[PDB]
């Protein structure tokens, strides 16, 4: 009785528990994915300067106004693919679709870059108003991710948002301060030579400067990370070629 | 849909594989065999146990009974045994109680020796001689406002080989009791009616067992006397129900019969030929009478003995005839009594107050060498503590003090 | 081999399971009364973690990853049940294989060996291994290092508590509260490794 | 007459007196002025002259040179920075707006670049003294409260605790933050364990760590180490990391920090840490008297030198802290202050001669390790000491177990 | 040759001149009941009873068969008792010369006498109480034996008498006592001494050992630690040189020998010197007209480990060979804890006194401070020459952790061994009492 | 009778007396939202697991009783985790690994073994609810102070205006780190055992 009853009890309990667990797990995948997508869409709309309250409005406006696209970093022109679901973070891990940088190339200290990245085009009908570029780099405590919206001239920033960072709330966490993110509106990424020109200034930027942005107060080790990420992703190994194309066409 | 089938199948397979692995490992890593116990002398009366039985329970099933105060487990630690082999480690559950003693010879409580090993056991002789008897009540009469004397006739004309000051155990089945059935004499009805105690009732639905000391000494062959007090609800807390075994014994009458167990050995007097002092109060008359009679008549010794009893009132005296006769015929014995709370009908002119204070003021405060005497005491806790403190302030060492507790 | 040295050092110090992630606190606080018992429990935890993390890595990589079994199928929702079942089986096997049978050494722990299943440290370690996507050797090294770090923390706490025989703690704080405060103070000292990116 | 006055009011405080609850205060005040006048009741009928009062007063006196030089240096740094930034009417307006500055000028000092040592020390005092008074009063309140509630006599040690805590903070620390830090250090780390001689952590460093992790913006960065309004300037350890010996420039004066400047104490930083010469002069005394552990000091030095030389040998092409030699490690930051006065706390250290060496070596190793390979913080003495406090009892255990084995072998 | 490097020679003033002289007449002697650890007396005499020398006064309950006898012939005049009726003293007033007598032997038979005969003769005369047992410093049980008997032929206590001066007067008795011990022991007899010469016993199992260094070098505990480490399994007996002389006299002439030679010294003693007295002499009568005016404390034994001899305790102890006198210090000084002490002794270097080497101090009984917690500035390590962790052991004693103290080595110690640790404690702890409490717990529990 | 659901709150508090559930208390008490969600999840899991384990208490094979109990608990917590990911994604992202760790949370297994294995299903359910409330008491009390003094808000509502946005309060940075939880729990235990002396531990 012992062995037979033990096996019977375990089998029956496993059957019931597995039925419940599998049914519940398979019945909620769609909603879990919807929540995950809404989280990102809300931030993209926020940085794009479009307001949206509620999932229905977020989805409506994102579908109406945003057009994800894939870009090849080496050549800077658009490439075909499933941009709406492409996962750049995972794409960067695998050697099949990711390169490893060199000491003098890895200014942002990211250790790798995926071959193709996703950019979002903001549209006001059939025309394109601006491009949102996801960038990231290493801070003092964590890896910092941000969106930067560039206008159609390919030089002028219209917004910046850090949507993932783990710095100290009072010192390095100020990258998320609205008053500091508001300084980027109107700055120009490149100079008349078309070289990267964004400066993070320790002690504040000169009044009326079109390339300088105040550094974080008492957070030099994070201002350096911001400067490194920008001067990398604006270079030849990042969105440099793509922005060069944008400056005179392609978009 | 396919994911559901795969999830079900993999859940079941994983759980089943883990269970099967555990069972297979168990079948080879567990001894799964027989195990026995035996006295160190390896007599023919070996003991066979299941590998999952407690040592105390196994020994009780084998007939080797031991004292108990909780019906199982460790409550007081009186159930101690000696082990040579098998019991290769002592757990903190024996160091906690009773603490230390550093028994180099391997002593442990029998409530937690367990399990898997062929056990070598050593026990005292008294534990080998336990027997169970059925007795017939000769008399059951009141001698105080809450105390009876139960007299039992030993069956088949045999006499229990007990020692003065020892105790036996009574065993009774599940019973129900009501106090209106008691035949309380008119000498004690006043206080019962004062609190209307006849209204109380109690019951128990399992067999019960209790221990009692006997007021006789081994020269009174064939009969056992027990001074039993009835356990009533505390006067300040009438909420709780009364006791069971005392009520049952009070319910018994002459001609009835009850089943008892053999005696257990402890509280024996020392043989140092020193003066002995007995302090008693209330129900603690049985050990004192046993010791006094055994010392004076069976051993026929000339040691100096004195007995001091703290009585509530003259209405509560008994064995006065025996003690007076002993004090009148023997030049080496004397006995005194004091009334804790006398009442007018006593017409009392003797010692009053607590017995410890009486003894201090009259005998010990001017005694030559208190520490050289031996003190045997038994009574309520708030007499016992006072006596102990008094003796301590006189410098008496613990080895010369013997204290018996009925359980508070 | 410097990669594995870095991983081991990170696991022991820069990512101390007890005083950086704060897992296993129930036994960390209850059993740290004496250094010898703490050392025994730490050894047991080391063994269990080392045997557990690699096996769970194997099972996850073979049957639980997406497309691991059949293309287009994802059984990752069985992660918790698989992890806990493996851990429980391994510890129940340990109890029968070593402690109660050799040398024996069971009596030292008693109540505390069976409940190593619920030790949050092991489950958290396997969860972190899955999140980090280690190889087999990395899983072995990570498990060993995390167990060693947990043992280090518990032994240090036991040493402090033994040193506190001379203290005079308020009655309301004696025992559990003062131990909580002591662990809080230990956390401050262990915050020295925060900025290291090993 | 203080003697007979104290001896007359004595009866009001003994059990049953009208002031029985203030017995702790009465005893603390009376035995500060006069000695107890007691005799030996048993055992050894003659006793050593030393006592905890003298033990603590010697340590309290040992840091006076460091405190005075710290005040002078703080004043000089502040004045130099102010005159570097502002001039003329702008400087006058700046002075009129800060009570430190216009008090210094009211009491006969001058805030111009030609100020003397007197004015510089006065300006340093107007920063140091408020902090010290706040710390002293707030911590003494808690100590006396615990002693009254638990009905004990007030033990000694707070004199050392308060002064060290006041000396290991920047000159610009807010007073409410100082109060919170001392409250934490005294209550959580010392009093909850029974008081003096019964804790396991260092109270002053515990309070400093509380401040460090709770309000990092006021105890780190470029804005806190020089008491000049609007002045921003890094210090030596932060400069060496960004990096090399060529980055050590005193921007307020334009000169280059030299080893002698660092050794004497002409550099910004915590109030009392700067002067290695003064710290050594003070520590030599208490080491000679046998109150400080030369074994602990030697262990710290050994660990520091070993790890510094290892880093120097293996070298690095990116981290400039790999170049710093041991003699620069010695004079930069708060290494000397901690080594001499905070790593030698008898209660927090090991109780065995052979364990003290390991304790010191661990502290020395950890300090350099945090300085070099931890980019978050420029210095690591406080963290290293707090870390070694956790493992000192374990070294004691390791030593005592070997002793016990020797005993069991019938050779000890 | 063993050299002790860690210790302290206390530089107290009033050191005796090592020349023996007669003492003032003694008319009362007493036996002190509280100095025998673990003793519960049973009185065999009553006030007014006449006694003879070597007659039993009381017998121990907890150590059956051990007898304590009268040092002199007279009559009992007092039986002092204290709290909880503890016996303090049994006082006898000297009168007459009656005595009990025993057997006598030739000098060449002692080395071959029988062990049981030796034991019986020692027990009957009450001289069996000269021995003490490490651990627990109790009188040995009658039925027990020991492999190691330690003789202490050196004295390093401050103001102590020089053993060689006394021994040279009683060479034959000392050698006879050594011979008797050689037969009483089942192992070897260790004669611990300094570099100077002493009379020698010719028995193979009696051997001399030389110790050098500051004070702690002269203690039976140090000698045991270095020659025969003791524990629960291994037990050693200790006896001092004057008791050895007494044993030799006993077995040579058949009479109890109760003479003593003690040093009377101290800062307040006018003419420190060695004095001939009798066992249990009255210290009040002994130090009569020997001391300067003022309030003083009379101590039987060293200022390190003696007993305050006042009231019912004003008699020479059984195991004490000196008397010390010094002023009761009760002055209160302004900021005394902070002054630079040119006249203040200390084992540390915080006072100006240590700069004046060769200085001697008129020490008093002041406690230079108040009771406080223990801050380990490392003073204990400077005065403990044994292989132990003094700070850990002392904190175990303070905390009451008997089990840990036993592991750390408490069984090897006696109250005399922690006298210097008590001396140099900034917290003014008294460690002898704590050690005695821990040993009491350990002995009771097992 | 009510006492069975209220005793665990103060008389037999899990974290403060037993002691169980310390890990989640340390981890998830930096925001009242996460603390409250964890409290509810633990209540639900413990109550349901107690009910189900008691329902089949007479048939569990002694050999693998741990396996059976952990299977039930793991199934329940898996369902809870799926539901949280479906409907409370933002809070699930913050709870991270501690949702799964409910399986090894000592309270659930302790109650399942000690009580559910020897009691009727409805009493077991009530015991689970009471223990969950006792756990939530400590969780919410610690989270209150931590969140308030560390960020000036409760449940995300601004209560103390911050200086960084024009307010007057400067948040404490230590309240967002682990040691603050240890200190808070220690002082809470101190207060509880002051107001209920019977819980004071012996000297040694
Ligand atoms: C060695 C030994 C010798 C003894 N000798 C004698 C002897 O010679 N004579 C003698 O009379 N007895 C003797 N006793 C005592 C005896 O064994 C019984 O304890 C006694 O007789 C009472 O038994 P009972 O069954 O009547 O009461 P019990 O049922 O044991 O107790 C009932 C009493 O307890 C109260 N009570 C019950 N439950 C509670 C509760 N939850 N809270 C509070 N109060 C409660 C009841 O109100 C009542 O007062 C001896 C005991 C021992 C161990
Ligand atoms: C005893 C002591 C310990 C210190 N510990 C630390 C520390 O652990 N971390 C830290 O960043 N600064 C610490 N400091 C402060 C620095 O030593 C120094 O005063 C300050 O960082 C000045 O900047 P700099 O080091 O870049 O010159 C400590 C100071 C003292 C006196
Ligand atoms: C100070 C005074 C007049 C009264 C005490 C009342 C009070 C408010 C004290 C707060 C500071 C304090 C508790 C110091 C302890 C301590 C004392 C009292 N005397 C000391 C004396 C010498 C050396 C150290 C100490 C020491 O460290
Ligand atoms: S049966 Fe209860 S203690 Fe033995
Ligand atoms: S909740 Fe108990 S170990 Fe984590
Ligand atoms: Ca990328």
From Swiss-Prot, chain A:
Key words of the record: Cell inner membrane, Cell membrane, Flavoprotein, FMN, Ion transport, Membrane, NAD, Phosphoprotein, Sodium, Sodium transport, Translocase, Transmembrane, Transmembrane helix, Transport, Ubiquinone
Cofactor(s) the record lists: FMN
SMART domains associated with the record: FMN_bind
Modified residues (FMN phosphoryl threonine): 220
Annotated TM spans: 7-27
Cell compartment(s), UniProt: Cell inner membrane
Protein name, per record: Na(+)-translocating NADH-quinone reductase subunit C
Taxonomic classification: Bacteria, Pseudomonadati, Pseudomonadota, Gammaproteobacteria, Vibrionales
Gene behind the chain: nqrC
UniProtKB/Swiss-Prot annotation, chain C:
GO term, biological process aspect, one: sodium ion transport
EC number: 7.2.1.1
Reaction(s) this enzyme catalyzes, per UniProt: a ubiquinone + n Na(+)(in) + NADH + H(+) = a ubiquinol + n Na(+)(out) + NAD(+)
Predominant cellular place of this UniProt entry's protein: membrane
Membrane-crossing residue ranges in chain numbering: 11-31, 39-59, 77-97, 110-130, 140-160, 176-196
Cystine pairs: none
GO MF term list: oxidoreductase activity, acting on NAD(P)H, quinone or similar compound as acceptor
Keyword Membrane: yes
Class of enzymatic activity (EC top level): translocase
Keywords of this entry: Cell inner membrane, Cell membrane, Ion transport, Membrane, NAD, Sodium, Sodium transport, Translocase, Transmembrane, Transmembrane helix, Transport, Ubiquinone
A Pfam family the protein falls into: Rnf-Nqr
Membrane topology: Multi-pass membrane protein
GO cellular component: Gram-negative-bacterium-type cell wall; plasma membrane
Family that this chain belongs to: Belongs to the NqrDE/RnfAE family.
Protein name: Na(+)-translocating NADH-quinone reductase subunit E
Species for this entry: Vibrio cholerae serotype O1 (strain ATCC 39541 / Classical Ogawa 395 / O395)
Curated annotation (Swiss-Prot), chain E:
Enzyme class: translocase
One of the record's GO molecular function terms: oxidoreductase activity, acting on NAD(P)H, quinone or similar compound as acceptor
Pfam families (UniProt xref): NQRA_2nd, NQRA_N, NQRA_SLBB
GO biological process, one term: sodium ion transport
Superkingdom of the source species: Bacteria
UniProt catalytic activity: a ubiquinone + n Na(+)(in) + NADH + H(+) = a ubiquinol + n Na(+)(out) + NAD(+)
EC number(s) from the headed UniProt entry: 7.2.1.1
InterPro entries referenced in this protein's UniProt entry, alphabetically: NqrA, NQRA_2nd, NqrA_C_domain, NQRA_N
Keywords in alphabetical order: Ion transport, NAD, Sodium, Sodium transport, Translocase, Transport, Ubiquinone
Role of this protein: NQR complex catalyzes the reduction of ubiquinone-1 to ubiquinol by two successive reactions, coupled with the transport of Na(+) ions from the cytoplasm to the periplasm. NqrA to NqrE are probably involved in the second step, the conversion of ubisemiquinone to ubiquinol.
Family: Belongs to the NqrA family.
Self-association and partners: Composed of six subunits; NqrA, NqrB, NqrC, NqrD, NqrE and NqrF.
Protein's name in the database: Na(+)-translocating NADH-quinone reductase subunit A
UniProtKB/Swiss-Prot annotation, chain F:
Pfam family, one: Rnf-Nqr
One Gene Ontology CC term in the entry: plasma membrane
EC number: 7.2.1.1
The reaction(s) this protein catalyses: a ubiquinone + n Na(+)(in) + NADH + H(+) = a ubiquinol + n Na(+)(out) + NAD(+)
Localization per Swiss-Prot or TrEMBL: Cell inner membrane
Keywords: Cell inner membrane, Cell membrane, Ion transport, Membrane, NAD, Sodium, Sodium transport, Translocase, Transmembrane, Transmembrane helix, Transport, Ubiquinone
TM spans (from-to): 36-56, 66-86, 97-117, 125-145, 172-192
Biological processes per GO annotation: sodium ion transport
Subcellular location, principal: membrane
InterPro entries: NqrD (IPR011292), NqrDE/RnfAE (IPR003667)
Source species, domain of life: Bacteria
Membrane topology: Multi-pass membrane protein
Record GO terms (molecular function): oxidoreductase activity, acting on NAD(P)H, quinone or similar compound as acceptor
UniProt signal peptide: none
Its job: NQR complex catalyzes the reduction of ubiquinone-1 to ubiquinol by two successive reactions, coupled with the transport of Na(+) ions from the cytoplasm to the periplasm. NqrA to NqrE are probably involved in the second step, the conversion of ubisemiquinone to ubiquinol.
Family to which the UniProt record says this protein belongs: Belongs to the NqrDE/RnfAE family.
Subunit structure: Composed of six subunits; NqrA, NqrB, NqrC, NqrD, NqrE and NqrF.
Protein name: Na(+)-translocating NADH-quinone reductase subunit D
Native source species: Vibrio cholerae serotype O1 (strain ATCC 39541 / Classical Ogawa 395 / O395)
């Amino acid at each position: 009785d012992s062995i037979k009853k033990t096996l019977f009890v375990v089998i029956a309990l496993s059957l019931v528990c597995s039925i419940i667990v599998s049914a519940a797990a398979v019945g909620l995948r769609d909603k879990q994915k919807e929540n995950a997508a809404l989280d990102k869409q809300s931030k993209i709309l926020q940085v794009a300067g479009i307001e949206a309250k509620g999932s229905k409005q977020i989805v409506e406006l994102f579908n109406k106004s945003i057009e994800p696209r894939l870009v090849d970093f080496n050549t800077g022109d658009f490439v075909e693919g499933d941009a709406a679901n492409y996962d750049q973070r995972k794409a960067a891990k695998e050697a099949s679709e990711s390169i490893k940088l060199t000491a003098e190339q890895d200014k942002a200290k990211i250790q790798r870059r995926a071959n193709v990245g996703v950019v979002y085009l903001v549209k006001d009908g059939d025309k394109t108003s601006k491009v949102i570029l996801p960038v990231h780099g290493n801070g003092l405590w964590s890896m910092m991710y941000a969106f930067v919206a560039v206008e159609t001239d390919g030089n002028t920033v219209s917004g910046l948002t850090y949507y993932e960072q783990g710095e100290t709330p009072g010192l390095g966490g100020e990258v998320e301060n609205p008053a500091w993110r508001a300084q980027w509106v109107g700055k120009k990424l490149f100079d008349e030579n078309h070289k990267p020109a964004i400066k993070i200034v320790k002690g504040g930027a000169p009044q009326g400067s079109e390339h300088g942005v105040d550094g974080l107060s008492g957070a030099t080790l994070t201002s350096n990370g911001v400067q490194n990420t920008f001067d990398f992703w604006l270079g030849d190994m990042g969105f440099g070629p793509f922005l060069t194309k944008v400056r005179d066409g392609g978009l | 849909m396919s994911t559901i089938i795969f999830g079900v199948v993999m859940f079941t397979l994983i759980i089943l594989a883990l269970v099967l692995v555990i069972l297979f490992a168990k079948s080879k890593l567990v001894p799964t065999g027989d195990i026995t116990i035996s006295i160190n002398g390896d007599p023919e009366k070996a003991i066979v146990t299941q590998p999952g039985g407690k040592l105390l329970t196994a020994l009780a099933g084998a007939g080797v009974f031991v004292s108990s105060a909780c019906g199982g487990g460790g409550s007081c630690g009186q159930c101690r045994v000696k082990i040579k082999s098998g019991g290769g480690d002592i757990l903190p559950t024996e160091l906690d109680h009773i603490s230390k003693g550093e028994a180099r010879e391997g002593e442990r409580l029998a409530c937690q020796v367990a399990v898997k090993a062929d056990m070598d056991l050593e026990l005292p002789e008294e534990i080998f001689g336990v027997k169970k008897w059925e007795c017939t009540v000769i008399s059951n009469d009141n001698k105080a406002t809450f105390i009876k004397e139960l007299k039992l006739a030993i069956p088949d004309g045999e006499s229990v080989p007990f020692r003065a000051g020892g105790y036996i155990q009574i065993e009774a089945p599940a019973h129900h009791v009501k106090y209106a059935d008691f035949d309380v004499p008119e000498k004690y009805r006043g206080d019962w009616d004062k609190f209307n105690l006849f209204r109380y009732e109690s019951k128990v639905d399992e067999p019960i067992i209790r221990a009692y000391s006997m007021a006789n000494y081994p020269e009174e062959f064939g009969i056992i006397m027990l001074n039993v007090r009835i356990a009533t609800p505390p006067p300040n807390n009438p909420n709780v129900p009364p006791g069971q075994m005392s009520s049952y014994i009070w319910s018994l009458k002459a001609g009835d019969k009850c089943t008892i167990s053999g005696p257990f050995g402890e509280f024996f007097a020392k043989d140092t030929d020193a003066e002995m002092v007995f302090i008693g109060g209330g129900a603690g008359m049985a050990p004192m009478r046993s010791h006094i009679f055994d010392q004076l008549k069976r051993l026929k010794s000339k040691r100096k003995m004195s007995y001091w009893y703290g009585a509530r009132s003259k209405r509560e005296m008994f064995y006065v005839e025996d003690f007076d006769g002993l004090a009148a015929e023997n030049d080496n014995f004397v006995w005194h009594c004091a009334l804790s709370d006398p009442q007018p009908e006593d017409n009392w002119t003797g010692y009053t107050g607590f017995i410890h204070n009486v003894l201090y003021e009259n005998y010990l405060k001017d005694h030559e060498a208190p520490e050289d005497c031996e003190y045997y005491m038994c009574g309520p806790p708030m007499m016992n503590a006072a006596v102990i403190n008094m003796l301590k302030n006189l410098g008496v060492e613990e080895e010369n003090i013997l204290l018996d507790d009925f359980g508070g | 081999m410097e990669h594995y040295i870095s991983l081991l050092v990170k696991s022991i110090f820069i990512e101390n399971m007890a005083l950086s992630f704060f897992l296993g606190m129930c036994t960390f606080l209850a059993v740290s009364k004496k250094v010898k018992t703490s050392f025994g429990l730490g050894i047991a935890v080391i063994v269990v973690l080392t045997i557990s993390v690699p096996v769970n890595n194997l099972v996850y990589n073979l049957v639980l990853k997406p497309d691991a079994l059949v293309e287009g199928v994802d059984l990752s929702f069985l992660n918790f049940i698989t992890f806990i079942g493996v851990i429980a089986a391994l510890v129940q096997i340990l109890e029968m294989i070593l402690d109660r049978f050799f040398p024996p050494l069971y009596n030292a722990l008693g109540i505390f060996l069976p409940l190593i299943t619920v030790n949050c440290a092991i489950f958290g370690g396997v969860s972190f291994m899955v999140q980090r996507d280690y190889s087999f050797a990395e899983s072995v090294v990570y498990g060993f290092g995390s167990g060693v770090g947990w043992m280090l923390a518990i032994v240090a706490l036991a040493g402090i508590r033994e040193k506190m025989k001379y203290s005079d703690v308020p009655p309301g704080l004696r025992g559990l509260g003062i131990t909580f405060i002591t662990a809080g103070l230990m956390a401050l000292g262990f915050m020295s490794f925060s900025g290291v990116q090993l | 007459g203080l003697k007979k006055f104290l001896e007359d009011i004595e009866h009001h405080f003994e059990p049953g007196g009208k002031h029985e609850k203030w017995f702790a205060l009465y005893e603390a005040a009376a035995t500060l002025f006069y000695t107890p006048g007691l005799v030996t009741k048993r055992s050894s009928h003659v006793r050593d002259s030393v006592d905890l009062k003298r033990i603590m007063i010697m340590v309290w006196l040992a840091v006076f040179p460091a405190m005075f030089w710290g005040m002078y240096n703080a004043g000089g740094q502040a004045i130099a920075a102010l005159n570097h930034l502002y001039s003329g009417d702008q400087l006058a307006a700046i002075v009129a707006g800060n009570w430190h500055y216009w008090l210094t000028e009211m009491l006969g000092g001058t805030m111009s670049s030609d100020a003397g040592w007197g004015s510089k020390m006065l300006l340093g005092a107007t920063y140091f003294l408020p902090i010290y008074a706040t710390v002293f009063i707030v911590g003494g309140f808690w100590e006396v409260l615990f002693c009254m509630v638990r009905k004990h006599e007030v033990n000694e040690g707070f004199f050392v605790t308060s002064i060290l805590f006041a000396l290991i903070v920047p000159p610009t620390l807010p007073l409410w933050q100082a109060a919170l830090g001392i409250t934490f250090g005294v209550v959580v780390a010392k009093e909850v364990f029974g008081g003096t001689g019964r804790n396991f952590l260092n109270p002053a460093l515990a309070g400093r760590a509380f401040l460090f992790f709770a309000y990092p913006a006021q105890i780190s960065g470029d804005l806190v180490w020089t008491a000049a309004d609007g002045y921003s300037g890094a210090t030596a350890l932060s400069q060496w990391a960004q990096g090399g010996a060529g980055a050590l420039i005193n921007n307020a004066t334009g000169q280059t920090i030299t080893w002698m400047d660092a050794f004497i104490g002409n550099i910004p930083g915590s109030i009392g840490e700067v002067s290695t010469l003064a710290l050594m002069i003070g520590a030599a005394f208490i080491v000679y008297m046998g109150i400080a552990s030369w074994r602990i000091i030697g262990g710290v030095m050994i660990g520091m030198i070993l790890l510094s030389t290892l880093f120097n040998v293996i070298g690095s092409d990116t981290n400039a802290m790999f170049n710093m030699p041991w003699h620069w490690h010695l004079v930069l930051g708060g290494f000397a202050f901690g080594m001499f006065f905070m790593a030698t706390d008898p209660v927090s250290a090991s109780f065995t001669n052979s364990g003290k060496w390991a304790y010191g070596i661990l502290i020395g190793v950890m300090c350099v390790l945090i300085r070099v390979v931890n980019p978050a913080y420029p210095e690591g003495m406080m963290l290293a000491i707090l870390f070694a406090n956790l493992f000192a009892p374990l070294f004691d255990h390791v030593v005592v177990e070997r002793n016990i084995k020797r005993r069991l072998a019938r050779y000890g | 040759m063993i050299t002790i490097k860690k210790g302290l020679d206390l530089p107290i003033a009033g050191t005796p001149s090592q020349v023996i002289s007669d003492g003032k007449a003694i008319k009362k002697v007493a036996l002190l009941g509280e100095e025998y650890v673990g003793m519960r007396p049973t009185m065999h005499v009553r006030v007014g009873d006449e006694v003879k020398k070597a007659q039993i006064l009381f017998e121990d309950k907890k150590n059956p068969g051990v007898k304590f006898t009268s040092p002199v012939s007279g009559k009992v005049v007092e039986i002092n008792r204290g709290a909880k009726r503890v016996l303090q003293s049994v006082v006898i007033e000297v009168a007459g010369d009656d005595q009990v007598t025993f057997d006598k032997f030739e000098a060449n038979q002692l080395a071959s006498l029988n062990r049981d005969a030796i034991k019986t003769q020692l027990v009957e005369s009450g001289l069996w109480t000269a021995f003490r047992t490490r651990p627990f410093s109790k009188v040995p049980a009658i039925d027990s034996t020991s492999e190691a008997i330690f003789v202490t032929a050196m004295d390093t206590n401050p103001l102590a008498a020089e053993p060689t001066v006394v021994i040279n007067e009683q060479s034959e008795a000392f050698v006879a006592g050594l011979d008797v011990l050689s037969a009483l022991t089942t192992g070897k007899v260790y004669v611990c001494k300094k570099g100077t010469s002493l009379p020698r016993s010719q028995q193979p199992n009696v051997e001399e050992h030389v110790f050098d260094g500051p004070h702690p070098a002269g203690l039976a505990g140090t000698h045991m630690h270095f020659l025969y480490p003791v524990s629960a399994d291994h037990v050693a007996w200790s006896i001092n040189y004057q008791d050895v002389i007494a044993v030799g006299q006993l077995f040579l002439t058949g009479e109890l020998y109760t003479q003593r030679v003690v040093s009377l010294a101290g800062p307040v003693v006018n003419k420190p010197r060695l004095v001939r007295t009798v066992m249990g002499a009255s210290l009040e009568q002994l130090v009569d007209s020997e001391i300067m005016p003022g309030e003083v404390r009379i101590i039987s034994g060293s200022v390190l480990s003696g007993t305050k001899a006042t009231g019912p305790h004003a008699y020479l102890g059984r195991y004490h060979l000196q008397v010390s006198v010094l002023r009761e210090g009760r002055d209160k000084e302004l900021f005394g804890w902070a002054m630079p002490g040119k006249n203040k002794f200390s084992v540390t270097r915080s006072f100006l006194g240590h700069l004046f080497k060769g200085q001697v101090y008129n020490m008093t009984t002041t406690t230079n401070g108040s009771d406080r917690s223990m801050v380990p500035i490392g003073n204990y390590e400077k005065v403990m020459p044994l292989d132990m962790e003094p700070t850990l052991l002392l904190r175990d004693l303070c905390a009451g952790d008997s089990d840990s103290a036993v592991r750390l080595g408490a069984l090897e110690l006696d109250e005399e061994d922690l006298a210097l640790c008590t001396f140099v404690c900034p917290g003014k702890y008294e460690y002898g009492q704590l050690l005695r409490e821990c040993l009491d717990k350990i002995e009771k529990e097992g | 009778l009510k006492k069975s659901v209220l005793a665990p709150v103060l008389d037999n508090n899990p974290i403060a007396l037993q002691v169980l559930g310390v890990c989640s208390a340390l981890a998830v008490t930096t925001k009242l939202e996460t603390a409250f969600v964890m409290t509810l999840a633990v209540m639900f899991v413990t109550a349901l697991s107690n009910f189900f384990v008691s329902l089949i208490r007479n048939h569990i094979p002694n050999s693998v009783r741990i396996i059976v109990q952990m299977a039930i608990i793991a199934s329940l917590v898996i369902v809870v985790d799926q539901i949280l990911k479906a409907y409370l994604y933002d809070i699930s992202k913050q709870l991270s690994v501690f949702v799964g760790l409910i399986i090894t949370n000592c309270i659930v297994m302790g109650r399942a073994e000690a009580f559910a294995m020897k009691s009727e299903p409805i009493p077991s359910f009530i015991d689970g609810i009471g223990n969950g409330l006792g756990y939530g008491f400590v969780l919410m009390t610690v989270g209150f102070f931590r969140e308030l003094l560390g960020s000036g808000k409760l449940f995300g509502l601004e209560v103390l205006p911050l200086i960084s946005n024009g307010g007057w309060y400067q948040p404490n940075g230590l309240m967002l780190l682990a040691p603050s939880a240890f200190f808070l729990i220690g002082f809470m235990i101190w207060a509880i055992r002051t107001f209920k002396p019977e819980q004071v531990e012996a000297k040694e």
